[PDB]
């Protein structure tokens, strides 16, 4: 029942707050206006957890990334309202075909000069140096602007041909970057000259340059419309004009459109759209803000038709069309950080123009932290994870999505462990990989008592459990028929005569007070409860937003072996119903469900497999046979070749390496699976394999059971006439690709047979998957 707004402190917050009081007048809703430091990236963190302001104000360049992460709500404007604003302003706030924010103002930088000191402002950048020396004789300077933010330096960088990214037939091509172009080098090299010819100071930030121009110590500055207000109260005659040209071509400022976005987790979205559509985006509202600190050009054609008469706004628009309109694609944050570091370093002489800017082509589209090598060193997105020793399993634990057990068996879990040491577990089964159509549900009741740490599985806790009962409920009329029949064949006599099962009725499959049981029919076992591990992550170091993950024992890939299978690895984690990720919608749906009302998971569309690229593990993976490992895969779709790195460790946190395997080969794209809905079949050939021992124990064993092996030396295992390996080896694989909540792609490969054997025959292809790998940059 409130409205919180975040706006940068270089804009008119008090003006916006006054459009807010009129909201309080007509509707009685408080509007609170805050200008947090570095708000552009306070927003991604607080919003990801469900928190944050209701409305976020920023240029369009950063909103595409917010939307990709699911932080922005789609805005619902009437076509009548949409006509009020200019089409290009809407085009800037459009991501993936959806409108994601309300356009407010069009901003571009311009040349601001003191007419008293400089009645005729320079027309070219190259005449600035001589101009400097010979105002320098009067104890003044020619040009001073903020060199700490690349927004103020870009105009010069783009003049000769430096292009942030390439616009190709309606697309911005992140594979065509021009920060290391010859054109970019010229602009930065020129800037460096002035910084080295004592014409400009490397330290100069916004505050320093603003103080100088507004006190007449410099004759020129580069700034935006927001800056005009203070100069106006600086008793200094000043003019706004076109930016100096560089090497005959004009300075190209990056054009940004100030926009208001509605938090995807806002409880007051109708009020937010109400405040923006009918209070702010009005001739009265925009004026109230433009009086505080000028917005320059505006998106409302009504007000724009009037402001365009002010010559400052016209120069703003002249430079804007001389410039380029910022892309909203999510790679902008990495583009800005790379160009930022380039400028600060070359200005400081830390890196040669070419060298500093050379890195900008290696860091433009992706953060260094998104590269495969960093992700391997900092797992879980560099989260700290605290392991609960001894674990506490009390609470409600739910699945995070549509799990796949071997079979395939598409299912979700809902497990309640009580303080009396008793438990009620729901296993919901479905007919598809979307978990939208329940087939049958299992209700498992019994008792569980945690023991002590496992000496077999490092990081696991052993547990003892006892079943009291297993019941099954069929949710379709067909399932009741099929299962009753399957129960009949499997245990002839379990079903009394004329007892065809009916839907929505719980039937006993296992009672501890009887020797009559047919758990074999569904190949049921509950040995997952014998191995337990809890991992916590406290986001923002707070108990709230804490994510608790419960890891239970893994399921055998062969259903007939589950009764005897004695866990050595983990199932995918469950999350605590009270302490889960805000983006987990499945958690809540599963939490609010029961044996008679199964959880219906949100529909997501099957994605098409695009192996091209590099993929790495997200966590220290645990494979059957207590094997800790991470994986790095490189897929060449150009020649259908693949390389894989398997890094093995002895600890559940993957810090003590033991051995490393390198494999390379060829793969054949295959057919969509009919056995495993949502999966695509593949055949992989391993042609080459290299082994690197990483500890003395592995080197010793290799030397004993065998080119002598030593720690850290990679050795091919195929000589010309090791451990008995047989290369070439053929593998029949199953693959699926999905997208996580902030739009990163996940690659799932076939679960490795629980017995340790290989899928070396088509009938041995997996019907389940391993934990997903995430896409990374090289
Ligand atoms: O310098 C990189 C940043 O450029 C723009 O930030 C501008 C912004 O558009 C303007 O309203 C503000 O007041 O000035 C800053 C530059 O200091 C992008 O919008 C940012 O996302 C970039 O990081
Ligand atoms: C992924 C298909 C080929 C896998 C063969 C690579 C060399 C075999 C040694 C690694 C163990 C098998 C694990 C492969 C499964 C995977 O990690 O994707
Ligand atoms: C254990 O506690 C739960 C929660 O109060 C309750 O539903 C269940 O019946 C209890 N069982 C026993 C044996 O006390
Ligand atoms: C159970 O299976 C047996 C053998 O397949 C069959 O003869 C019998 O008819 C089945 N039960 C029913 C009631 O169909
Ligand atoms: C496949 O292509 C990659 C790069 O596209 C190259 O490095 C590799 O040598 C090629 N392999 C074969 C067998 O053509
Ligand atoms: Cl992709």
Residue numbers in the entry: 8 to 713, 721 to 735, 739 to 795
The authors write:
Adenomatosis polyposis coli down-regulated 1 (APCDD1)—a conserved single-span transmembrane protein containing a large extracellular domain—negatively regulates WNT signaling and plays important roles in hair follicle development, CNS vascular development, and glial differentiation. The APCDD1 ECD consists of two closely apposed β-barrel domains (ABD1 and ABD2). ABD2 contains a large hydrophobic pocket that accommodates a bound lipid. Collectively, the results of this study suggest that APCDD1 serves as a negative feedback regulator of WNT signaling by neutralizing WNT ligands.
Therefore, we produced, purified, and crystallized a fusion protein between engineered maltose-binding protein (eMBP) and APCDD1, collected X-ray diffraction data to 2.3 Å resolution, and used molecular replacement with eMBP to obtain phase information. Although the resulting electron density map provided a good fit to the eMBP half of the fusion protein, the map of APCDD1 was of insufficient quality for model building. Recognizing that the N- and C-terminal halves of APCDD1 have ~25% amino acid identity and similar predicted secondary structure patterns, and, therefore, that APCDD1 very likely consists of two domains with conserved three-dimensional structures, we used this constraint, together with the RoseTTAFold prediction algorithm, to generate a three-dimensional model of APCDD1. Fitting this model to the electron density map of eMBP-APCDD1 provided the starting point for iteratively solving the structure of the APCDD1 half of the fusion protein. Intriguingly, we observed an electron density consistent with the acyl chain of a lipid molecule in the hydrophobic pocket of ABD2 in two of the four eMBP-APCDD1 structures (chains A and C). We suspected that these lipid molecules became bound following APCDD1 secretion from HEK293 cells, which were grown in the presence of 2% bovine serum, a plentiful source of lipids. To define the identities of the bound molecules, we extracted hydrophobic molecules from the purified APCDD1 sample used for crystallization and analyzed the extracted species by high-performance liquid chromatography (HPLC) coupled with mass spectrometry (MS). This analysis revealed stearic acid, a C18 fatty acid (i.e., with 18 carbon atoms), as the most prevalent species. Therefore, we modeled a molecule of stearic acid into the electron density in the ABD2 pocket; the subsequent structural refinement revealed a good fit between stearic acid and the electron density. Interestingly, this structural analysis also revealed different lipid conformations in the two APCDD1 structures, both of which exhibit multiple contacts between the lipid and hydrophobic side chains lining the ABD2 pocket.
